[PDB]
Amino acid sequence: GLFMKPIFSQARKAPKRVVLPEGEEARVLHATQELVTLGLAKPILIGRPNVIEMRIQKLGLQIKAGVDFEIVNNESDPRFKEYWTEYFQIMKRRGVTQEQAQRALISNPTVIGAIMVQRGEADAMICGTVGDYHEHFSVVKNVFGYRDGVHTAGAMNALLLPSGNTFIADTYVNDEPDAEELAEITLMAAETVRRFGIEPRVALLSHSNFGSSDCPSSSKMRQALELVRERAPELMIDGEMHGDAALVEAIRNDRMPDSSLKGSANILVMPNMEAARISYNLLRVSSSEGVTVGPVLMGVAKPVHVLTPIASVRRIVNMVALAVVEAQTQPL
Amino acid sequence: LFMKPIFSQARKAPKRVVLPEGEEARVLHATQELVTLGLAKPILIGRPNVIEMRIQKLGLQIKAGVDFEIVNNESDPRFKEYWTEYFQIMKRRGVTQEQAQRALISNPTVIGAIMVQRGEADAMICGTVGDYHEHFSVVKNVFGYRDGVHTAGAMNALLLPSGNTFIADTYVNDEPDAEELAEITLMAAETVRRFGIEPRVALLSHSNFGSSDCPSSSKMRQALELVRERAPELMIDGEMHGDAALVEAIRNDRMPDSSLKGSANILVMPNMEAARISYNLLRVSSSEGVTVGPVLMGVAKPVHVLTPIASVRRIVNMVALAVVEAQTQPL
Amino acid sequence: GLFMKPIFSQARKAPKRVVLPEGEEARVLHATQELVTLGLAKPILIGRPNVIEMRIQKLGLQIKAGVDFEIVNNESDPRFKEYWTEYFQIMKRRGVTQEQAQRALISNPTVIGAIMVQRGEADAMICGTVGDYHEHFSVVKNVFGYRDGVHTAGAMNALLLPSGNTFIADTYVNDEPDAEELAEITLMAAETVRRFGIEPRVALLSHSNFGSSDCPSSSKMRQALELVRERAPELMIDGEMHGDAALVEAIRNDRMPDSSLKGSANILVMPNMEAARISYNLLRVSSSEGVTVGPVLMGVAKPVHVLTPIASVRRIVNMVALAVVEAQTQPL
Amino acid sequence: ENLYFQGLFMKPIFSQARKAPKRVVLPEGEEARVLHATQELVTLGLAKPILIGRPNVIEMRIQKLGLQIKAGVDFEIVNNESDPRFKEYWTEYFQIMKRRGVTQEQAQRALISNPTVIGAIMVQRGEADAMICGTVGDYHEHFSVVKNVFGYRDGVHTAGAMNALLLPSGNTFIADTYVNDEPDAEELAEITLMAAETVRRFGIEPRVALLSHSNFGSSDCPSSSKMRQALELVRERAPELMIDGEMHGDAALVEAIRNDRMPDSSLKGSANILVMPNMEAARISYNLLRVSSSEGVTVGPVLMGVAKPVHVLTPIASVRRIVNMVALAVVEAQTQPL
Amino acid sequence: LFMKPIFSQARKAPKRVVLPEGEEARVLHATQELVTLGLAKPILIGRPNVIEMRIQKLGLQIKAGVDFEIVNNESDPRFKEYWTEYFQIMKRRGVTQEQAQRALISNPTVIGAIMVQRGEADAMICGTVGDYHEHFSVVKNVFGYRDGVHTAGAMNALLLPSGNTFIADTYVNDEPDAEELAEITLMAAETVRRFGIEPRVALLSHSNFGSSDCPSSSKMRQALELVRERAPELMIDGEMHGDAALVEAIRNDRMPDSSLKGSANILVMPNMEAARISYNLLRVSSSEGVTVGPVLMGVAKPVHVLTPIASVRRIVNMVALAVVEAQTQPL
Amino acid sequence: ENLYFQGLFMKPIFSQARKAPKRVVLPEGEEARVLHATQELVTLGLAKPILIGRPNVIEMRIQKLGLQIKAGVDFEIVNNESDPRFKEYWTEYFQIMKRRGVTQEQAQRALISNPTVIGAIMVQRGEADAMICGTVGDYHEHFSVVKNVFGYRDGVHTAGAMNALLLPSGNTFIADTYVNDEPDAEELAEITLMAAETVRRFGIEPRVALLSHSNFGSSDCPSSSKMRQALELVRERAPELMIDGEMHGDAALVEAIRNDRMPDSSLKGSANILVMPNMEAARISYNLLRVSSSEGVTVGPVLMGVAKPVHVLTPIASVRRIVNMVALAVVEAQTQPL
């Protein structure tokens, strides 16, 4: 994960305030300790100070409130009225009553952190250590919106594979994206990887090997590729192709000797989420050797990432680090 | 090697297997290895001169009419009996008498399927050249489905860190319905029993135990229900993440009392796209050699369609399976 | 050379009362004179007696309202209440108010005729010398309904091609019938020709020659065949095939040597009404020799036929004759 | 003029091919019917024929039929199982079809077992001027090779087939009978203009009718509307062209019938181009009309909208047609394709 | 009453109004009131025999030829020009010369519409007999939509406790799309301006400001975006419950910033079912009474289609309304 | 009579409740309207209330409202933030929802953070007899939990909500108003039966009318047939029930209007049950009638089909409605759920 090394360095240059809504989690508190020691961020945890301070003394951590990290009590906070008032303003015509907004800013810590970032009291947020992705992504898309020039959002997960470090298409946001949606995700994935210091080498995957099937999926991947070629004529990309051809140049030269994709692709764009998560899932527990980033959320208008319940202390740290560099420039 | 049981069972009662790509370097290399180990009595299709010429250039010992039989796709007296039968089958399916005559000359798979169907051959291994669907169409049209089975499915094996693993459907159905997934699961489960392995099925989806209400997840859950009634004894559970299927520790944190115990060795997927991309990426990233694949299930005669990038070992293994399949009953 | 000869003969032996809703039409008055002269039917015209008796003079005809043909005055009749009350009893829950039913039985002669036939004050009806086919058909379907065992209606037209007398269905009712509707039409058409004393030899037509295409139009014909063979294993039928394969034995014998169909098919069943009408219209004015019958309505539970506005004086006489025989026997 | 009379419209076509014969490939060069046509083609001096097939099987059949055409003297034979330009051919076919589900291995086989691909590649390379194929097989087997290898003409995004009949009212053309199962409003409008300009070249005035069971708006079916839309698009791009619809077949062919329903119809006399809603109505109508008309046919199926002069025919196509469609294809190599 | 400024403007310039149903009793009472109050110059249609025969039995004082004209549907010297213009309009819409000829004898609404198109009349009031859509078909076909509009809509009035309330669309479109609703809304607002009332619109749904995601509540939200874009001056809000539309305090608790002030007077409905059922149940329940409805909007001539149960008062009120449309422009 | 009178049909419900008071869970225990309602319930001896919320906040309000009810004495408070049954509660919820996208982690959050789940589990376990909820938020927010935990009654595969208006015609009920958006023929049939059984329990003769914008066939929507197909199912399933349709609202409520259209309808006098084709037409009709009538509501929304005595209310519910709906829910527990 050498690509995380430059991010740790950039984050320490200008540490940013990062909200962590699940502040009573053992994995989150450990990461808060590491982030303070590394000096990459100024952590803001959300929860009951009774449960936070106690579990800190059960795990033996030096971090203390008011000094190393800020605590926001979801059950009591002078900023409550200013928060539910802003959430209502944003969701009043989206099914949220003043009462529904109030309950949210008390028992939904993801909404509290999102509103903090939206107000400007926080510069970034890392959530999803507990729950389901859409429980948290719904809130982030609703409060922050998309960034100028994008009408879709996607998630990218990375795996260290024998062939190299590989990234996978929307693994958690869109179930069956359309050609235009896939095109935007492809550009956002490529832009994200260039920002990690790596050259983007993109493969659009299918069971169709360069036109061998006419199913709507293979057909949508082919449409996606031209849209990408029109908008990014200098980006290394080719498809649609088999997985094996994306990773092994040899297998690809026998099928498309003059494929503009050189070497072994580092970015793999999938046609549907079922193919992406199952591949990502099966690869991680079998063919991978130490993930670094993921799930990387691209296209939201604020620096934010939703994670998964199995997210390790190293991932939370790495994703916070990434989100700080995100807050220094422009959201991914 | 889980193949040994297969090779040994083959060796005891070897059966006639048609290899329609008789002129292929790989098929000749395989024919010699099959005859040395006494696994199958091979029949190759192609030009006898071209086969005998290439047997020489490759330094091979097998000789025709002695170790193997050749069927000249251009010159054979049975030509009239073959196109006549393929026409009887395909006359209402857009195949004319004239098209049926071209078919039994320039399509080795049709020749090879009509052979198996007439009992002049017991099994067939094809696909080392061309598109999977090109060959499968012939196979399905000529042989039809087994009794009680209304769908076909392909299954590929892998040696992953979690042990042997099978993925379906990988080549026949793009978006199989619940009944099709229920039929593929039962077929796959019994196929794995014949290899001498306890079948441990996991139906997969991005959805983890009711987490998503997309049509794919429902499809898998309706599929689980149909498989429960039909096989109360089969170890199966879902719909779940791939990670929970292979790693018990992860599954126990989500669903402690899942009827799936240990690691799942059969992974039934929602769509071909998921099945192949998963397989393709795991095959090159978890290199541990090759065994079986793509194993065809639910066809009335012993037959398997393969890939152009198939190796000599795979052809030898799949022929060996096809022989055991010719004995006993089709998978 | 008249296949109508057997039909007329049987009509003349026991004439039946036939309603002609377009009683004021020139062609219908001519047809009544001819029908009375040939003693085939006891006619019942509908319209203003003032206007019927006037143009019977102007056309120098020798028929009278006393005995020759009974007249039903639509603007005045002592059976008015009983009619609209019956028409309302049928259509009360089908969108027709009492007021709408009272107008129908004054200024819709096809509805008057339909109710008359339903009440048994007439045995058969011929209509559609004016207006659109469905205006008249929907009235006939509503009041009469389908025959027992039948769940659809169909029109059949006749041509003299070189191959012989040749019938086409469905030409006017179902615009795109399903496999089940085609199956019933085929069986109705076979018995209609069998009743004309002709061997029914059926071809289901398509642009697909025995499976050359897998369009949902040709599949429909393939399924219609199965359904027909189960229900009438004696009937001579085959399909789906080209029109040239249906009519020329050599073209078919070369493609399908064991075809159950022999010589020329004399019933051409069509996948859609577009194919049906365009074929007939083009054939009727190109293979123009002469025809006596059509459009022959089938599946309606009373002896009724809807004609076109271009129907000749003989066509009306012919169809009236045919209608008399179903009345004597059972409806087509 | 010559629209009422039999095959007169094809005298200029023979006159123009005789003046400058072009090279025409006949992929099914081992078919008895094709061999007879080559002879008459050589005899009438209409085209320099190029057959694809096994040289032995062709000659054996030339002597068996009693033909005096001689290999290397009257025509050229391209051996499908042997040719020194075999590598150059599969190389160009692969470059066309690499992204369309054809491997390098599959490309090689096609240029040895598919004579229509061999022939298409010949014409695309300029080693032949035209091709006449599909005397054996299915129209779409051949057409999809034609389309893939050649593409459409400029300003055209759909191809169409047109078949001629000699009905009592005169020479009449029907489209689309073989390429599009259900064409959309745009596709129909393109086919119409192609059919119109094809009939112009035959030295006949195009009189188009859009056919339907809907007589000028008597049904609001999806097909009826498509035709009304097609009519507007045609009147936009070709306001000089005589066309009306949508109408019954009888009204299109018989002026008297039409005048009763639409006196002011901009269609005058009898229509000679019948454009239909779907391939089902198109082929059932032609098929029945061809066997029920007593007069014979000359051209069909005329492929329109492809960037090289090519026609795919039917297995029941007579020896005379093969000659008349080659003659047409030669005039098409000179001049422009359609 | 808001009919007084209308009744007044009618007396200024009484115009020619075709009442197709001249043989009906309710239309005959109404035409007497029209000449007495001097609102329109009636042109009734039907058999002059049964008109005078019924004028007497009803006991009326209207002199045929002096007070009102009779156009005999059976015998008229303009017949040939009438079916020709109708044929010129419906020639390509499946109407033959024979059907046109029968239409201009047997369909009074077609006679009426052609008179208005010809200029020989100024407005028409019909629908006192038969289905709404029978008459609308004719009216839509002959006249078409007015400039800038591709949608027609009917609008009924109530007197609820909040005041004069209008509901659309109740008689023309079963399922209007977002753009159709957007157009109906702007027509309904202008019509209500012409009555002298300020348009205060609510787009109704079982969804309250985003609480549901069904395609019909999404349609209403999309319809609002369209009206706000095109007509920023119009007081509108939605989608909301009917109670939120008519009770300031219920709306203020859910949407305090709402651009809608007081109780809405225009209730725009997602479909004809929700509209008619609401109107039907409120009419019988709210009681009181109204002088207008159904008001047709979007058509290129002064025309209005009524219902068979329309009172003698309505025909006079709608005729007067039509006379004002005859001056000025069509609603 | 129970019909045509204000709140008279309710007297037996209070009468019956007083005899055997049951324990009813009020998940919104911190709401003033629920605290007022709790006082009235204790004073009139209708039920043993169990509130849910922060025992601290609740106690401040019982005072800031100057009420006499006391915790542990006149009513019981279940602390959402801390309970000695929390383990078996999240466990029993997990068992129900483990294959419906709920992790053990997600369950634990919910039995602390969602009062309606705590309430649902209490009633299910048998620690409570009934539940009245939905005084805050969206209807479906509460119904989805109620459906998940309790499921349907035997021989019922659909839930339905019914509101009541005193219209000039008399007490009139409308369904479905809050559960199904586009219910099918089968669902409308089960809703009609449940609506009738509920109206009978109130001691009123059920007179049903299936409503449409079609008057007996005037229109062939999918909606019109839906109502016509629902009529067939109901007539077979319950010949005793007075019903007819599809018809306009006016015809439903006013005999003279119905007699003119359909002289011999099965429906006599005035309909008291109006069954609606879609939730859109149902809620809009009710909402506009509730505000335009001068007569107050007594019951609504009455949930039907659930296997436990439960009712989801609106946030605009008055203290009296809650008190009424709790009494109805007590009598359901003493008997069989609706």
Side-chain angles (χ1 to χ4, degrees), chain E residues 60-88:
Chain E
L60 264 61
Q61 330 157 22
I62 202 166
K63 311 193 70 60
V66 193
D67 298 328
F68 71 99
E69 293 175 5
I70 299 165
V71 166
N72 186 23
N73 69 274
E74 288 181 335
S75 198
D76 207 59
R78 292 116 89 194
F79 181 79
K80 200 174 205 287
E81 302 95 300
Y82 276 22
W83 72 250
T84 284
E85 262 166 14
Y86 188 55
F87 177 77
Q88 282 314 304

Coordinates of all heavy atoms in Angstrom, one line a residue, chain E residues 60-88:
Chain E
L60 N -93.9 28.0 -22.9 CA -92.8 28.9 -23.0 C -93.3 30.1 -24.0 O -94.3 30.0 -24.6 CB -91.6 28.2 -23.6 CG -90.6 27.8 -22.5 CD1 -91.2 26.8 -21.6 CD2 -89.4 27.1 -23.2
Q61 N -92.5 31.1 -24.0 CA -92.9 32.4 -24.8 C -91.8 32.7 -25.8 O -91.8 33.8 -26.3 CB -93.0 33.5 -23.8 CG -93.3 33.1 -22.4 CD -92.9 34.0 -21.3 OE1 -92.6 35.2 -21.6 NE2 -92.8 33.6 -20.1
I62 N -91.0 31.7 -26.2 CA -89.9 32.0 -27.2 C -90.4 31.7 -28.6 O -90.7 30.5 -28.9 CB -88.7 31.2 -26.7 CG1 -87.4 31.8 -27.3 CG2 -88.8 29.7 -27.0 CD1 -86.1 31.2 -26.6
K63 N -90.3 32.7 -29.4 CA -90.8 32.6 -30.8 C -89.7 32.0 -31.7 O -88.7 32.8 -31.9 CB -91.3 33.9 -31.3 CG -92.3 34.6 -30.4 CD -93.1 35.7 -31.0 CE -94.1 35.3 -32.0 NZ -95.1 34.4 -31.4
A64 N -89.9 30.9 -32.3 CA -88.9 30.3 -33.3 C -88.7 31.3 -34.4 O -89.7 31.7 -35.0 CB -89.4 29.0 -33.8
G65 N -87.4 31.7 -34.7 CA -87.1 32.6 -35.8 C -87.0 34.0 -35.3 O -86.2 34.8 -35.9
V66 N -87.7 34.3 -34.2 CA -87.7 35.8 -33.7 C -86.7 35.8 -32.6 O -85.7 36.7 -32.7 CB -89.1 36.2 -33.3 CG1 -89.1 37.7 -33.0 CG2 -90.2 35.8 -34.2
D67 N -86.8 35.0 -31.5 CA -86.0 35.0 -30.3 C -84.8 34.2 -30.5 O -83.7 34.6 -30.0 CB -86.9 34.5 -29.1 CG -88.1 35.4 -28.8 OD1 -88.0 36.6 -29.0 OD2 -89.1 34.8 -28.3
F68 N -84.9 33.0 -31.1 CA -83.8 32.0 -31.3 C -84.0 31.4 -32.7 O -85.1 31.2 -33.2 CB -83.8 31.0 -30.2 CG -85.0 30.0 -30.3 CD1 -84.8 28.8 -30.9 CD2 -86.2 30.4 -29.8 CE1 -85.9 27.9 -30.9 CE2 -87.3 29.5 -29.8 CZ -87.1 28.3 -30.4
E69 N -82.9 31.0 -33.4 CA -82.9 30.3 -34.7 C -82.9 28.8 -34.4 O -82.4 28.3 -33.3 CB -81.6 30.6 -35.5 CG -81.5 32.0 -35.9 CD -80.2 32.4 -36.6 OE1 -79.4 31.5 -36.8 OE2 -80.1 33.6 -36.9
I70 N -83.5 28.0 -35.3 CA -83.5 26.5 -35.3 C -82.8 26.1 -36.6 O -83.2 26.4 -37.7 CB -84.9 25.9 -35.3 CG1 -85.7 26.3 -34.0 CG2 -84.9 24.4 -35.5 CD1 -87.2 26.1 -34.1
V71 N -81.7 25.3 -36.4 CA -80.9 24.6 -37.5 C -81.5 23.2 -37.5 O -81.1 22.4 -36.6 CB -79.4 24.7 -37.3 CG1 -78.7 23.7 -38.2 CG2 -78.9 26.1 -37.5
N72 N -82.3 22.8 -38.5 CA -82.9 21.5 -38.7 C -81.8 20.5 -39.1 O -81.1 20.7 -40.1 CB -84.1 21.5 -39.7 CG -84.8 20.2 -39.8 OD1 -84.8 19.3 -38.9 ND2 -85.5 20.0 -40.9
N73 N -81.5 19.4 -38.3 CA -80.4 18.5 -38.6 C -80.8 17.6 -39.8 O -79.8 17.2 -40.5 CB -80.2 17.6 -37.4 CG -81.3 16.6 -37.2 OD1 -82.3 16.9 -36.5 ND2 -81.2 15.4 -37.7
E74 N -82.1 17.4 -40.1 CA -82.6 16.6 -41.2 C -82.6 17.4 -42.5 O -82.4 16.7 -43.5 CB -84.0 16.1 -40.8 CG -84.0 15.0 -39.8 CD -85.4 14.4 -39.4 OE1 -86.4 15.1 -39.7 OE2 -85.4 13.3 -39.0
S75 N -82.8 18.7 -42.5 CA -82.9 19.5 -43.7 C -82.3 20.9 -43.5 O -82.9 21.7 -42.7 CB -84.4 19.6 -44.1 OG -84.5 20.0 -45.4
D76 N -81.2 21.2 -44.2 CA -80.5 22.5 -44.1 C -79.8 22.8 -45.4 O -79.2 21.9 -46.0 CB -79.5 22.5 -42.9 CG -79.2 23.9 -42.3 OD1 -80.2 24.5 -41.9 OD2 -78.1 24.3 -42.3
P77 N -79.9 24.1 -45.9 CA -79.2 24.4 -47.2 C -77.7 24.5 -47.1 O -77.1 24.6 -48.2 CB -79.8 25.8 -47.5 CG -80.1 26.4 -46.2 CD -80.6 25.2 -45.3
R78 N -77.1 24.5 -45.9 CA -75.6 24.6 -45.7 C -75.0 23.1 -45.6 O -73.7 23.1 -45.6 CB -75.3 25.3 -44.4 CG -75.7 26.8 -44.5 CD -76.8 27.2 -43.5 NE -76.2 27.7 -42.2 CZ -77.0 27.8 -41.1 NH1 -78.3 27.6 -41.1 NH2 -76.4 28.2 -40.0
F79 N -75.8 22.1 -45.6 CA -75.4 20.7 -45.5 C -74.2 20.3 -46.2 O -73.3 19.7 -45.6 CB -76.6 19.8 -46.0 CG -76.3 18.3 -45.8 CD1 -76.5 17.7 -44.6 CD2 -76.0 17.5 -46.9 CE1 -76.3 16.3 -44.5 CE2 -75.7 16.2 -46.8 CZ -75.9 15.6 -45.6
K80 N -74.1 20.6 -47.5 CA -73.0 20.2 -48.4 C -71.7 20.8 -48.0 O -70.7 20.1 -48.1 CB -73.3 20.6 -49.9 CG -72.6 19.9 -51.0 CD -73.1 20.3 -52.4 CE -72.8 19.2 -53.4 NZ -71.4 19.1 -53.8
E81 N -71.7 22.1 -47.5 CA -70.5 22.8 -47.1 C -70.0 22.2 -45.7 O -68.8 22.2 -45.4 CB -70.7 24.3 -47.0 CG -71.2 24.9 -48.3 CD -72.7 25.0 -48.5 OE1 -73.4 24.0 -48.4 OE2 -73.1 26.2 -48.7
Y82 N -71.0 21.8 -44.9 CA -70.7 21.3 -43.5 C -70.0 20.0 -43.5 O -68.9 19.9 -42.8 CB -72.1 21.2 -42.7 CG -72.6 22.5 -42.1 CD1 -72.1 23.7 -42.6 CD2 -73.5 22.5 -41.1 CE1 -72.6 24.9 -42.0 CE2 -73.9 23.7 -40.5 CZ -73.5 24.9 -41.0 OH -74.0 26.1 -40.4
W83 N -70.5 19.0 -44.2 CA -69.8 17.6 -44.3 C -68.5 17.7 -45.0 O -67.6 16.9 -44.6 CB -70.8 16.5 -44.8 CG -71.1 16.5 -46.3 CD1 -72.3 16.9 -46.9 CD2 -70.2 16.2 -47.4 NE1 -72.2 16.7 -48.2 CE2 -71.0 16.3 -48.6 CE3 -68.9 15.7 -47.5 CZ2 -70.4 16.0 -49.8 CZ3 -68.3 15.4 -48.7 CH2 -69.1 15.6 -49.9
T84 N -68.3 18.7 -45.9 CA -67.1 18.9 -46.7 C -66.0 19.4 -45.8 O -64.9 18.8 -45.8 CB -67.3 19.8 -47.9 OG1 -68.0 19.1 -48.9 CG2 -66.0 20.4 -48.5
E85 N -66.3 20.4 -45.0 CA -65.3 21.0 -44.0 C -64.9 19.9 -42.9 O -63.7 19.8 -42.6 CB -65.8 22.3 -43.4 CG -65.3 23.5 -44.0 CD -66.0 24.8 -43.7 OE1 -66.8 24.8 -42.7 OE2 -65.8 25.8 -44.4
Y86 N -65.9 19.2 -42.5 CA -65.7 18.1 -41.5 C -64.8 17.0 -42.2 O -63.9 16.6 -41.5 CB -67.1 17.5 -41.0 CG -66.9 16.5 -39.9 CD1 -66.3 16.8 -38.8 CD2 -67.4 15.2 -40.0 CE1 -66.1 15.9 -37.7 CE2 -67.3 14.3 -39.0 CZ -66.6 14.6 -37.9 OH -66.5 13.7 -36.9
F87 N -65.1 16.7 -43.4 CA -64.3 15.7 -44.2 C -62.9 16.3 -44.4 O -61.9 15.5 -44.3 CB -64.9 15.4 -45.6 CG -64.1 14.4 -46.4 CD1 -64.0 13.1 -46.2 CD2 -63.3 14.9 -47.5 CE1 -63.3 12.2 -46.9 CE2 -62.5 14.1 -48.2 CZ -62.5 12.7 -48.0
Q88 N -62.7 17.6 -44.7 CA -61.4 18.2 -44.8 C -60.6 18.1 -43.6 O -59.4 18.0 -43.7 CB -61.6 19.7 -45.3 CG -61.9 19.9 -46.7 CD -61.1 19.0 -47.7 OE1 -59.9 19.1 -47.7 NE2 -61.8 18.2 -48.5

